Every structure is written in C-alpha cells, then in structure tokens.
C-alpha cells in the first residue's frame, strides 16, 4: 500500500508531507520546527530525524506500508541544493521501519526564471 | 569611488550655480 512523501528540504526548515498517490489529501504533515525549541534548531538534520520518526509512526497507524519519495529543494530562483534535512529525512524515514518505493527530485527548475532577489551586486555580507 | 562622487558633487554644485543665474538673470 503506497503513499507519497514530499520531502521539502530547504534551509531554515524542513517539511515532510505524506499524501495518497494523488497528492490531494495529506495523511500527515510533520514539520521539523514542530519538533524543536530553537528557531535555529528548526533546520538541523536532527529535527528531520525525529520529525520523520513521527511520520513513520503516524504512517503505520494509518496503513500505507510503502512510500514513493519525492525530494524537493527551495527551487524557483533560489538554491537547488537540498537542505541539510533531506538526507537525514531519507535516512531516518527508511530505518525507522518503512519501505521506500521510488526516489525522485521534483525541485522547481525554470526554463528561465524571473529576476532573483538580491539586486545586481546581491547579498554582500 | 572618490572620483565618481567628486564628479557628482561638482554636478550638484554647478546645478546650484546655474540656479543662482536664472535668479539674477
């Protein structure tokens, strides 16, 4: 029995969003920041560790046994490199007791995008 | 950009000197 795990793995946060095979109903949506105290801990891979353990437990308690993963970065006119939490989420969400069906990156990549935040010289810090 | 901003200062100063001439015209 198959679900779909939308792993939004950006910086500053990480989302683990499980739906049915259509994407129209969210069985469970556990967020890394739901599982930590620090607005800086909300993006560390550990947050994704336990926020994926709870996805797995609330997924066994709903029935779907195998999971089509779909990883996704910030996308658009931003980074395309997944946040630290992507690999942590896959690692924990596989070994917490679960079956992964198919991996795929669905990060938004534009044929070419609108102007990107920062100005010409960009973020100089 | 001390060269550029010196040029911009003289641009402003010359604008104001021009204004004083359209006053005392």
């Amino acid at each position: 029995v198959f679900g779909v795990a939308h792993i939004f793995a950006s910086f500053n946060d990480t989302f683990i969003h499980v739906t049915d095979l259509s994407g129209r109903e969210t069985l469970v949506r556990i967020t890394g920041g739901m599982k930590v105290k620090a607005d800086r801990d909300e993006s560390s891979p550990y947050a994704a560790m336990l926020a994926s353990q709870d996805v797995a437990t609330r997924c066994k308690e709903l029935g779907i046994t195998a999971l089509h993963i779909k990883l996704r970065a910030t996308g658009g006119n931003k980074t395309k490199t997944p946040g630290p939490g992507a690999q942590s989420a896959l690692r924990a969400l596989a070994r917490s007791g679960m079956k992964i069906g198919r991996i795929e990156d669905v990060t938004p990549v534009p044929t070419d995008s609108t102007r990107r935040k920062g100005g010409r010289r960009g973020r100089r810090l | 950009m001390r060269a550029k901003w010196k040029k911009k200062r003289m641009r402003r100063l010359k604008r104001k000197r021009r204004k004083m001439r359209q006053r005392s015209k």
């Binding site: 560790m49 924990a92 070994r95 917490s96 | -």
Partner: protein, 64 residues
C-alpha cells in the same frame, strides 16, 4: 523510551572540534554486527573501546 545501545570503536578517524577536542570515531554495533556509523567522541578513546550510546540514528559527517 530508547534502550541504550552499544558499539566498539574500530578506528579513530580523527580529532575534530574548534579546539581539537572531539574525537571522531567509527563505531560498529554489537547487537547487530553489520551497522557501522561515524560518531563524535570526547576525551581519550582508543581502538576497541566499547561505547554506550543513548541515541543511535544520529551520525556525524567527515571533519565535522
């Protein structure tokens, strides 16, 4: 309710830390002896040391 799990340090990879004070080791799990994980360890640790380990699925990354 995590049950504290055990490992042996097969090799000491290095000595990370800003002040060079956290040994980074590579541990092998006693209860099932095919799980090998890179962890951080503080203080003097040599090869073959058995480490108790409260929480298991965290690992460090090379030159953390």
């Amino acid at each position: 309710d995590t049950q504290v799990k055990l490992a042996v340090v097969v090799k000491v990879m290095g000595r990370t830390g800003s002040r060079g004070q956290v040994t980074q080791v590579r541990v092998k799990f006693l209860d099932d002896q095919n799980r090998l994980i890179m962890r951080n360890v503080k203080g003097p640790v040599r090869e073959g040391d058995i480490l108790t380990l409260l929480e298991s699925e965290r690992e460090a990354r090379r030159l953390r």
